[PDB]
RNA sequence: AAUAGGCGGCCGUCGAGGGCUCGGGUAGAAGACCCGGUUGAUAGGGCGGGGAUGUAAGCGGGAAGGGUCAACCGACCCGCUUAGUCCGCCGCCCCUAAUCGCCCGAG
RNA sequence: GGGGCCAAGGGUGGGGGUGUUCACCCAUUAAAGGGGAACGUGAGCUGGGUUUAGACCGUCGUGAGACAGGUCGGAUGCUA
RNA sequence: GUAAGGUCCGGUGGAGCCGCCGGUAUCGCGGAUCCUGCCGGGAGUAGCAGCGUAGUCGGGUGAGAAUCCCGACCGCCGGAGGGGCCAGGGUUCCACGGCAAUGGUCGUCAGCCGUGGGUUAGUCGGUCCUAACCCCGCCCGUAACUCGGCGCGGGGGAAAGGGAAACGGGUUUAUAUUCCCGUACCGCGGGGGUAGGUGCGGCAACGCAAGCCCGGAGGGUGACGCCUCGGGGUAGGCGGACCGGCCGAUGAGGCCGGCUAAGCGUAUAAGCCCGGGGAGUGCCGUAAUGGCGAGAACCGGGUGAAAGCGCGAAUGGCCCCCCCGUUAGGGGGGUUCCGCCGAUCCCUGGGGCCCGUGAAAAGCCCUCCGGGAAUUCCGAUCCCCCGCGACCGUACCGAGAACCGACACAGGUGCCCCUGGGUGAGAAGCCUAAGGCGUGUCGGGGGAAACCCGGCCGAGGGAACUCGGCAAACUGGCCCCGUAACUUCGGGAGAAGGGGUGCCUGCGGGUGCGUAACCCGCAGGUCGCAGUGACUAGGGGGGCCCGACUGUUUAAUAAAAACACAGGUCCCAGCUAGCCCGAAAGGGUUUGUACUGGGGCCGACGCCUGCCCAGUGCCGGUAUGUGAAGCCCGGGUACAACCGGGUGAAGCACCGGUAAACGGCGGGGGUAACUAUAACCCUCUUAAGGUAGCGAAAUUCCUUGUCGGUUAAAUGCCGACCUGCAUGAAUGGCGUAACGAGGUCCCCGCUGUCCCCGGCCGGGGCCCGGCGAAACCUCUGCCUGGCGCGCAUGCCAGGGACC
RNA sequence: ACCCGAAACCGGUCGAUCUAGCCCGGGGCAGGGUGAAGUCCCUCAACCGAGGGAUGGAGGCCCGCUAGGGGUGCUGAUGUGCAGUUCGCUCCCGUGACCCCGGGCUAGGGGUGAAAGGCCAAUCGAGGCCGGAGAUAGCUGGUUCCCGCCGAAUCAUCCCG
RNA sequence: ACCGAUAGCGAACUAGUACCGUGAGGGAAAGCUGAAAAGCACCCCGGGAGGGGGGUGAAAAGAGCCUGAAACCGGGCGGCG
RNA sequence: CUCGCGGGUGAAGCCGAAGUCCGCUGGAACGCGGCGCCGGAGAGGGUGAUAGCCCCGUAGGCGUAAGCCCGCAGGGUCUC
RNA sequence: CUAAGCCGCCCGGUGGAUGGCUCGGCUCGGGGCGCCGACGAAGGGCGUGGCAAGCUGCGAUAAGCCCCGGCGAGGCGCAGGCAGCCGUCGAACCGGGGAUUCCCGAAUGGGACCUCCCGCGGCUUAUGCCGCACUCCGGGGUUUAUCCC
């Protein structure tokens, strides 16, 4: 929305920062056992809890 | 079964609560201490229309700086002066104890108890007649035709309530009735119990007739006092 | 336009800019004129305007220079005559 | 009516928002209390014995 | 047609006879079927015949009037004009394309 | 004309009221026969009647309500 | 080994495993429309049509192009598919690099994957005020509470209500009323002056800089419904002249640009006011209503909006021209006027309606009272200047792909605000400018069928079709004439029915200064089958039933005769009432008071509403009978338990009113000019026997009652009779104008409903290249007579059958 | 109590973004027709009267694909749909009892209802969620290895049987 | 004398996590290379994904990694056709 | 009660025997055959196979600040 | 040398059963230990790593800071990488004691349609500090308001 409160904006910012892929160096360090995390999200498909 | 309209009205929901914020305020007399043993002058400043009152109302400013709202008697003039107290002259718009009002006079806004503010004869176009005066009671005939005894110190105003004859003209339209009843938030339109389901009304049923006499006992419990309640008789008196 | 400007409490004007683009300007409506306390007739010598315009003016430019500037001339003269006679 | 076309009117103010106390999105905003922890209606937490939700949090069920 | 037929011709023990490809419909949902394929009028193009509408654009004249009763404007009409346009019909002319090529095939 | 025999190749239609089958009637006709096929045929159709949920009238029942008594309205799925 | 099963050989595997005795157990699989996982046939099939059918030709990038990019052509929307923006979404926004997956096909493209970025405020919103309403504290109730509640005190509550202040140009890949330049405004504090403390002009309305600080009161403003109309403006639009440019014959002629913000200064209109003035066989005025001795005409004036005008401002924006043109740049011109139409956008006044009365506070302005300083002094609402102005949102879509509906859903939310030219009454239909799109995203082929959906036409007849004129067809705009029964006098009514309508050449008329603009007639000439030529655009009439009308209803099979309605009548209540919610406390009607509050029934309007109080219900009385506990008396108990009597309220019994309270309103015996039926009239029978009306009815079983009209033919509709199985007066009776997507019958006109079906157009179907499921499935799957759980592809005997 | 399946009943809690009602604050309805009350004027006579012409804009008025709202027929298309109610044509209202947004209140034997047992988040002749709960049924379905030996019964009395 | 990854607590693991509903509340799936990464250097082809040689290892056990069944599908072989 | 003294218990923790002997199979000995050893220790686990003696542990012992408790010595209160 | 088709064996793909393993569960006699919070709890929001998304741990001193003891050469969590730094002045790790400890939350000076905002008194030169909620107990002053301490 055009008008937002700061607390909601900060929570949305935290979710935005969370939504990213696993580092490639993490993948090689873990030997391909860790390839993803449960916080991956698609804006038009998976909606935020808020 | 299910509840009745009268049963649901007792819970004070907004569907039934009166909208007491569109109105101008209650019209009560000034405290009895001012009026008793003293007579106060007041000036009529404005006459206006109260959404739910059935009568016009007027603003009065008294010589002691107190402002009040009163039921305007018929023929009241803006800018005129009125008197409230035992020594007030007998004229329309004057308020004074029933002991000082001669018999055969029309009065309105009578106090049930000295200082209660007035309960009787407040509707538009109504008046009561002073019948007899005694040292311990004054008899007054009310609009309903009853002779009621009031304490001599009870206060009343001389004249008749403005707005009479309101029922001469028809409410031609369902919309006219709609606005009239929406002004005060009265349940409108109303249904017929005989056309409800048996769950809703004592007279409800597939057939649109009452299966029982419509005169209900005065001792019937809530949810059953429908129709003619404790009726002495019914029908047309010849 | 924004929902706030969709209200009819704003008067809207279409203007063309010196750069050639048409713009919509919104302004707040002016108040009514002062009315006599007693009879309610309009007063004289009291300009209309919102609080900022009223504060933009000096004291003597917003009311007439005669006693009882809140009444029209008949009412002013009548009240003074009554007061003098009573005194 | 009552079906697909009805769900298009879910663009108004949400019924429930985040709760400052329990952190769950159950704060009834119009009435002013939480439907999960009772914030804004009581000082003590809203806990019921017929509910296993508060046991699920600490794996104590 | 399980008694799964008769006959003339052509081939085999390299090879008759076909299919795809090509130009078109006496045919057609795919398949199938029919005519033509330089031993040529199959389609297109040109010309000529027969048709359907109904007299083109342009120019010249008239036109109820108006216009300074002048220049000019004017719906519409008459002549060149059985015109102009068009043809999922026919005839003549190899001018263009029906070419190059590929694959089963009994023993 | 009346009665009976052989004969099932062919024909046996169009209209008025009524949902009607049926029966009645009209003008023609050689005649305008009766029947079986899950009372042939709704993964062919139509939905007028029957037979839900709404409502009116008559009668019955104290009442809720009911009537092989009337009346208005009332859905017909398919890529073989 | 009968078997449940055991053991051995060949191969894979790489670390555990078994014989026997004795115990223990979540100890043995074919089914539960069993549960979990995986895979099959259907199947390379449906779908990728229908509501907007859109692409083609050259060039480019690229391994790869119907699908991506540029140019032209051809198209769609154009009162929305264009522009602005809430809620919701939360990075979807921007650039570069990409195509394993997503995208109904492909894809070099992307709301997709990787990398790096992006949201700047004293003025715009929140923040301030309060509205409906809500919360905490005290207090009362509750066993108690996180529970219910009146009163008092405090607080909150609107991002579309009230409410201090900013607009132009430019800038970035992405932000701008926020950043840069130019020009302003408000709040607070400060400095130098000045008006004033101690000042003036007007008969007056009024004109003025017109002392400072603290507290209080009053007035105004904030601050207000709906309908209707006049006046004054402004956006936008149109025609002409001139300047520059593009097309055109480098003709006529068409199109494109000719721009201008806040702020500052400045005036009138309506309204109202101020002085003079002294009218009537009356004058004055409006669109209209109207005004006058309670002061008209008329002559002077004051105050008072939107606007325009000057600065801002040309140095800015826009169009064009010239030289340098290898990139990269630099200069010169202009941007000026008249006449119309004109808003739904602004300002301002009239008038009308309410049994309907259409918010509050904050803030702001003025006046008046009290108090406090000021004289070589104090001191502004007036000029000049200086300093300071915190916190949070600010990207983007804003929807036929960025929201909700599981979806890049034909729905819903938001069409929430706004809209050039022609035709035209019109924001209608059609065409078109601006802006947008070719992504309502799979393409190609074809006489390439049948058949299905959506359209166009059909000779002769014209409803013969059908339950039923279902569907389609006829009429259709405007001008003129003309118009029935009935009626509640309003209407019916656009009844019905008839005539005209194009283009061209000239006149007359209305308002107007006008040969500006809009509108109204007249004459003449002329073409077609057709002149509202396309688009737009009623078919009509006559009976009956029901409901007065507008309105509401089962979201998702019922829109109706059902509900509501206005009007009628009945019942309770004088207020510590009546009715109602609760466990209580308290509370709704109640900021109320009989012209009121609450409870039933009928349902506009016209004429009317008859008899019955025995039954049931309700209301009043109640001398008397009965009548629980308690109390009293006697008996019994060293006291009680216990037994018998007396008094005994309500309620019953008894008595009386009450039917616009529930309901009921029959039956026999009969009778008058036959042998004709029926009963004016008498007699019993229960409380009394159905009165006015209506009647085979939406009620009538016999029933397709009987008679008359409608047809050639009438289980229909209409009128009548009354033998009303089983009508009837407020669960109203009868009638009724107007009204109706209500039910039903008939007539004109019309037509492919039908005789009797035939052609044509677009999309599917069909073929080809791609993506690609699901319902369903015991295994199978030819028939005639049969046996059979009585209706067999599978059994019996026969007949057929190449895949 | 061998295992599975009920409609239902009770307790405490969650819901008025859908939809019903009411309160507070706000946006919208092209164009045209008809012509109520009110207010008048003109001409001839005048013992009475007769004949014409205006102005004004009311209505739960009228036509209307304006916007917006509704849903009669085709019993059209679709009916593993675009869609767990949609699309086209036709049709009805369109100044009012009108349509729609923001803020509030009414909650389950309860609310709300122009009364259809309608609506109360795809759920209504008593909502949803967890708990009693592994409810109960005489009713339906299922119940897992092998070989040996013997091998029935549907009938007398009683039971709301 | 408990079960041994459909078992055992719902969760052997980034599990009361992901995800579903406005809400009260509901709630999964998913363990294993090798002794040691020695996790395939270099060569040919392909736009790339990959393919074929050649190496490592006792064994490809090759990360889609212990063993590798059944159903299903492609090919070869024997019989019928 | 502790200005004082001694003692017990008390965190991490410390010590704790015996083969990595020869030959084969093997990628790798914890395996097979032979020869030895400790044992208050042959519970269990790891280590490239199944190990009492390779390692960790085990049988059996040791240490420990703060804190807690008992005793000595001294200073007080109260009861009978 | 049969087209389609059916059965059997072999090889290959698909799939993840079986066998083996197990830092996880479940159940137990006995034994140990059992509260935290206004000196601000539990629970939650947001931050914090060079490359850092989840979990875990920590809190603007943010996979950590300081001190006294054990251990004795490696260490930088789940988690096998690049590059770096830490440690012999004794780290990592273990037991004990301290420091920092954002916001909401009984939440408390006053408010919550957004875990974010707005105030009043004293000290402080200023950077900044200590108080200010309700219902009571034991006291004081006084403004007699329950006003202040
Ligand atoms: Zn006045
Ligand atoms: Zn909470």
PDB file of N, CA, C and O (backbone and C1' of nucleotides) in Angstrom, chain G residues 326-349:
ATOM      1  P     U G 326      32.999  15.129 -41.666  1.00  0.00           P
ATOM      2  O5'   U G 326      33.444  13.817 -40.878  1.00  0.00           O
ATOM      3  C5'   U G 326      32.674  12.625 -40.952  1.00  0.00           C
ATOM      4  C4'   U G 326      33.075  11.641 -39.882  1.00  0.00           C
ATOM      5  C3'   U G 326      32.884  12.106 -38.445  1.00  0.00           C
ATOM      6  O3'   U G 326      31.552  11.942 -37.988  1.00  0.00           O
ATOM      7  C1'   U G 326      35.041  11.168 -38.691  1.00  0.00           C
ATOM      8  P     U G 327      30.743  13.168 -37.334  1.00  0.00           P
ATOM      9  O5'   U G 327      30.653  12.787 -35.789  1.00  0.00           O
ATOM     10  C5'   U G 327      30.167  11.518 -35.378  1.00  0.00           C
ATOM     11  C4'   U G 327      30.974  10.971 -34.228  1.00  0.00           C
ATOM     12  C3'   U G 327      30.885  11.753 -32.926  1.00  0.00           C
ATOM     13  O3'   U G 327      29.761  11.376 -32.150  1.00  0.00           O
ATOM     14  C1'   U G 327      33.157  11.296 -33.433  1.00  0.00           C
ATOM     15  P     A G 328      28.508  12.366 -31.987  1.00  0.00           P
ATOM     16  O5'   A G 328      28.978  13.414 -30.884  1.00  0.00           O
ATOM     17  C5'   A G 328      29.710  13.000 -29.738  1.00  0.00           C
ATOM     18  C4'   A G 328      30.795  13.990 -29.402  1.00  0.00           C
ATOM     19  C3'   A G 328      30.327  15.415 -29.147  1.00  0.00           C
ATOM     20  O3'   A G 328      29.852  15.621 -27.829  1.00  0.00           O
ATOM     21  C1'   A G 328      32.118  15.452 -30.679  1.00  0.00           C
ATOM     22  P     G G 329      28.700  16.708 -27.561  1.00  0.00           P
ATOM     23  O5'   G G 329      29.042  17.868 -28.595  1.00  0.00           O
ATOM     24  C5'   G G 329      28.306  19.081 -28.613  1.00  0.00           C
ATOM     25  C4'   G G 329      29.036  20.146 -29.393  1.00  0.00           C
ATOM     26  C3'   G G 329      28.366  21.508 -29.458  1.00  0.00           C
ATOM     27  O3'   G G 329      28.585  22.285 -28.293  1.00  0.00           O
ATOM     28  C1'   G G 329      29.088  20.882 -31.617  1.00  0.00           C
ATOM     29  P     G G 330      27.529  23.418 -27.870  1.00  0.00           P
ATOM     30  O5'   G G 330      27.696  24.535 -28.992  1.00  0.00           O
ATOM     31  C5'   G G 330      28.942  25.187 -29.185  1.00  0.00           C
ATOM     32  C4'   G G 330      28.907  26.112 -30.374  1.00  0.00           C
ATOM     33  C3'   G G 330      27.774  27.123 -30.394  1.00  0.00           C
ATOM     34  O3'   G G 330      28.033  28.247 -29.572  1.00  0.00           O
ATOM     35  C1'   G G 330      27.982  26.115 -32.527  1.00  0.00           C
ATOM     36  P     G G 331      26.847  29.261 -29.198  1.00  0.00           P
ATOM     37  O5'   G G 331      26.748  30.214 -30.470  1.00  0.00           O
ATOM     38  C5'   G G 331      25.652  31.098 -30.631  1.00  0.00           C
ATOM     39  C4'   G G 331      25.453  31.472 -32.077  1.00  0.00           C
ATOM     40  C3'   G G 331      24.080  32.017 -32.429  1.00  0.00           C
ATOM     41  O3'   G G 331      23.892  33.378 -32.062  1.00  0.00           O
ATOM     42  C1'   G G 331      24.662  30.342 -33.978  1.00  0.00           C
ATOM     43  P     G G 332      24.461  34.586 -32.956  1.00  0.00           P
ATOM     44  O5'   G G 332      23.358  34.763 -34.089  1.00  0.00           O
ATOM     45  C5'   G G 332      21.993  34.941 -33.742  1.00  0.00           C
ATOM     46  C4'   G G 332      21.084  34.692 -34.918  1.00  0.00           C
ATOM     47  C3'   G G 332      19.605  34.929 -34.665  1.00  0.00           C
ATOM     48  O3'   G G 332      19.254  36.299 -34.751  1.00  0.00           O
ATOM     49  C1'   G G 332      19.895  32.864 -35.782  1.00  0.00           C
ATOM     50  P     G G 333      17.865  36.820 -34.140  1.00  0.00           P
ATOM     51  O5'   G G 333      16.848  36.712 -35.360  1.00  0.00           O
ATOM     52  C5'   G G 333      15.459  36.924 -35.167  1.00  0.00           C
ATOM     53  C4'   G G 333      14.641  36.077 -36.108  1.00  0.00           C
ATOM     54  C3'   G G 333      13.257  35.691 -35.614  1.00  0.00           C
ATOM     55  O3'   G G 333      12.295  36.707 -35.828  1.00  0.00           O
ATOM     56  C1'   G G 333      14.354  33.776 -36.454  1.00  0.00           C
ATOM     57  P     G G 334      12.175  37.940 -34.807  1.00  0.00           P
ATOM     58  O5'   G G 334      10.610  38.221 -34.736  1.00  0.00           O
ATOM     59  C5'   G G 334       9.760  37.431 -33.918  1.00  0.00           C
ATOM     60  C4'   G G 334       9.361  36.145 -34.598  1.00  0.00           C
ATOM     61  C3'   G G 334       8.225  35.384 -33.933  1.00  0.00           C
ATOM     62  O3'   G G 334       6.960  35.860 -34.346  1.00  0.00           O
ATOM     63  C1'   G G 334      10.003  33.895 -34.445  1.00  0.00           C
ATOM     64  P     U G 335       6.180  36.961 -33.480  1.00  0.00           P
ATOM     65  O5'   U G 335       4.905  36.167 -32.954  1.00  0.00           O
ATOM     66  C5'   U G 335       4.730  35.892 -31.576  1.00  0.00           C
ATOM     67  C4'   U G 335       4.764  34.415 -31.292  1.00  0.00           C
ATOM     68  C3'   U G 335       4.530  34.027 -29.843  1.00  0.00           C
ATOM     69  O3'   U G 335       3.156  34.007 -29.496  1.00  0.00           O
ATOM     70  C1'   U G 335       6.403  32.856 -30.677  1.00  0.00           C
ATOM     71  P     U G 336       2.527  35.188 -28.605  1.00  0.00           P
ATOM     72  O5'   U G 336       2.175  36.326 -29.660  1.00  0.00           O
ATOM     73  C5'   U G 336       2.706  37.636 -29.521  1.00  0.00           C
ATOM     74  C4'   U G 336       2.246  38.540 -30.635  1.00  0.00           C
ATOM     75  C3'   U G 336       0.799  38.996 -30.563  1.00  0.00           C
ATOM     76  O3'   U G 336       0.603  40.075 -29.670  1.00  0.00           O
ATOM     77  C1'   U G 336       1.285  38.266 -32.757  1.00  0.00           C
ATOM     78  P     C G 337      -0.867  40.368 -29.099  1.00  0.00           P
ATOM     79  O5'   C G 337      -1.818  39.866 -30.270  1.00  0.00           O
ATOM     80  C5'   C G 337      -3.215  39.740 -30.069  1.00  0.00           C
ATOM     81  C4'   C G 337      -3.988  40.222 -31.268  1.00  0.00           C
ATOM     82  C3'   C G 337      -5.495  40.069 -31.172  1.00  0.00           C
ATOM     83  O3'   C G 337      -6.092  41.124 -30.442  1.00  0.00           O
ATOM     84  C1'   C G 337      -4.755  39.246 -33.259  1.00  0.00           C
ATOM     85  P     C G 338      -7.633  41.040 -30.011  1.00  0.00           P
ATOM     86  O5'   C G 338      -8.392  41.759 -31.208  1.00  0.00           O
ATOM     87  C5'   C G 338      -9.806  41.816 -31.234  1.00  0.00           C
ATOM     88  C4'   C G 338     -10.350  41.432 -32.586  1.00  0.00           C
ATOM     89  C3'   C G 338     -11.660  40.674 -32.567  1.00  0.00           C
ATOM     90  O3'   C G 338     -12.773  41.517 -32.336  1.00  0.00           O
ATOM     91  C1'   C G 338     -10.178  39.649 -34.091  1.00  0.00           C
ATOM     92  P     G G 339     -13.822  41.156 -31.177  1.00  0.00           P
ATOM     93  O5'   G G 339     -14.723  40.026 -31.837  1.00  0.00           O
ATOM     94  C5'   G G 339     -15.276  40.215 -33.129  1.00  0.00           C
ATOM     95  C4'   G G 339     -16.024  38.994 -33.592  1.00  0.00           C
ATOM     96  C3'   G G 339     -16.805  38.250 -32.526  1.00  0.00           C
ATOM     97  O3'   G G 339     -18.045  38.863 -32.228  1.00  0.00           O
ATOM     98  C1'   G G 339     -15.600  36.708 -33.853  1.00  0.00           C
ATOM     99  P     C G 340     -18.977  38.261 -31.071  1.00  0.00           P
ATOM    100  O5'   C G 340     -19.460  36.867 -31.668  1.00  0.00           O
ATOM    101  C5'   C G 340     -20.012  35.873 -30.825  1.00  0.00           C
ATOM    102  C4'   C G 340     -20.045  34.528 -31.503  1.00  0.00           C
ATOM    103  C3'   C G 340     -20.362  33.352 -30.596  1.00  0.00           C
ATOM    104  O3'   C G 340     -21.750  33.200 -30.365  1.00  0.00           O
ATOM    105  C1'   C G 340     -18.468  32.838 -31.900  1.00  0.00           C
ATOM    106  P     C G 341     -22.317  33.142 -28.866  1.00  0.00           P
ATOM    107  O5'   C G 341     -22.342  31.587 -28.535  1.00  0.00           O
ATOM    108  C5'   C G 341     -22.994  30.675 -29.404  1.00  0.00           C
ATOM    109  C4'   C G 341     -22.419  29.290 -29.274  1.00  0.00           C
ATOM    110  C3'   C G 341     -22.376  28.728 -27.867  1.00  0.00           C
ATOM    111  O3'   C G 341     -23.627  28.236 -27.429  1.00  0.00           O
ATOM    112  C1'   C G 341     -20.324  28.305 -28.958  1.00  0.00           C
ATOM    113  P     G G 342     -24.113  28.519 -25.928  1.00  0.00           P
ATOM    114  O5'   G G 342     -22.975  27.860 -25.030  1.00  0.00           O
ATOM    115  C5'   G G 342     -22.694  26.472 -25.122  1.00  0.00           C
ATOM    116  C4'   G G 342     -21.479  26.092 -24.316  1.00  0.00           C
ATOM    117  C3'   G G 342     -21.463  26.563 -22.873  1.00  0.00           C
ATOM    118  O3'   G G 342     -22.254  25.764 -22.015  1.00  0.00           O
ATOM    119  C1'   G G 342     -19.378  27.025 -23.861  1.00  0.00           C
ATOM    120  P     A G 343     -23.342  26.450 -21.054  1.00  0.00           P
ATOM    121  O5'   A G 343     -23.248  25.608 -19.709  1.00  0.00           O
ATOM    122  C5'   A G 343     -21.998  25.403 -19.072  1.00  0.00           C
ATOM    123  C4'   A G 343     -21.453  24.029 -19.366  1.00  0.00           C
ATOM    124  C3'   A G 343     -21.268  23.117 -18.165  1.00  0.00           C
ATOM    125  O3'   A G 343     -22.467  22.466 -17.784  1.00  0.00           O
ATOM    126  C1'   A G 343     -19.319  23.071 -19.506  1.00  0.00           C
ATOM    127  P     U G 344     -22.977  22.511 -16.261  1.00  0.00           P
ATOM    128  O5'   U G 344     -22.217  21.297 -15.564  1.00  0.00           O
ATOM    129  C5'   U G 344     -22.603  20.850 -14.270  1.00  0.00           C
ATOM    130  C4'   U G 344     -21.961  19.533 -13.909  1.00  0.00           C
ATOM    131  C3'   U G 344     -20.429  19.530 -13.884  1.00  0.00           C
ATOM    132  O3'   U G 344     -19.946  18.747 -12.791  1.00  0.00           O
ATOM    133  C1'   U G 344     -21.210  17.857 -15.358  1.00  0.00           C
ATOM    134  P     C G 345     -19.384  19.462 -11.466  1.00  0.00           P
ATOM    135  O5'   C G 345     -17.798  19.384 -11.604  1.00  0.00           O
ATOM    136  C5'   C G 345     -17.159  19.626 -12.848  1.00  0.00           C
ATOM    137  C4'   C G 345     -16.032  20.623 -12.722  1.00  0.00           C
ATOM    138  C3'   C G 345     -16.208  21.698 -11.657  1.00  0.00           C
ATOM    139  O3'   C G 345     -15.752  21.279 -10.384  1.00  0.00           O
ATOM    140  C1'   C G 345     -15.670  22.721 -13.715  1.00  0.00           C
ATOM    141  P     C G 346     -16.295  21.988  -9.049  1.00  0.00           P
ATOM    142  O5'   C G 346     -15.669  23.450  -9.087  1.00  0.00           O
ATOM    143  C5'   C G 346     -16.097  24.423  -8.149  1.00  0.00           C
ATOM    144  C4'   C G 346     -15.579  25.801  -8.471  1.00  0.00           C
ATOM    145  C3'   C G 346     -16.370  26.942  -7.855  1.00  0.00           C
ATOM    146  O3'   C G 346     -16.029  27.174  -6.501  1.00  0.00           O
ATOM    147  C1'   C G 346     -15.963  27.408 -10.135  1.00  0.00           C
ATOM    148  P     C G 347     -17.183  27.381  -5.407  1.00  0.00           P
ATOM    149  O5'   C G 347     -17.629  28.891  -5.621  1.00  0.00           O
ATOM    150  C5'   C G 347     -16.689  29.943  -5.481  1.00  0.00           C
ATOM    151  C4'   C G 347     -17.282  31.269  -5.874  1.00  0.00           C
ATOM    152  C3'   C G 347     -18.670  31.566  -5.335  1.00  0.00           C
ATOM    153  O3'   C G 347     -18.672  31.980  -3.982  1.00  0.00           O
ATOM    154  C1'   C G 347     -18.595  32.106  -7.624  1.00  0.00           C
ATOM    155  P     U G 348     -19.946  31.670  -3.057  1.00  0.00           P
ATOM    156  O5'   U G 348     -21.076  32.617  -3.650  1.00  0.00           O
ATOM    157  C5'   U G 348     -20.849  34.009  -3.794  1.00  0.00           C
ATOM    158  C4'   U G 348     -21.934  34.667  -4.607  1.00  0.00           C
ATOM    159  C3'   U G 348     -23.351  34.433  -4.123  1.00  0.00           C
ATOM    160  O3'   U G 348     -23.692  35.254  -3.023  1.00  0.00           O
ATOM    161  C1'   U G 348     -23.261  34.129  -6.461  1.00  0.00           C
ATOM    162  P     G G 349     -24.927  34.865  -2.080  1.00  0.00           P
ATOM    163  O5'   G G 349     -26.017  35.967  -2.432  1.00  0.00           O
ATOM    164  C5'   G G 349     -27.398  35.687  -2.311  1.00  0.00           C
ATOM    165  C4'   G G 349     -28.130  35.980  -3.592  1.00  0.00           C
ATOM    166  C3'   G G 349     -29.564  35.485  -3.648  1.00  0.00           C
ATOM    167  O3'   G G 349     -30.460  36.376  -3.009  1.00  0.00           O
ATOM    168  C1'   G G 349     -28.436  34.863  -5.631  1.00  0.00           C
TER     169        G G 349
END
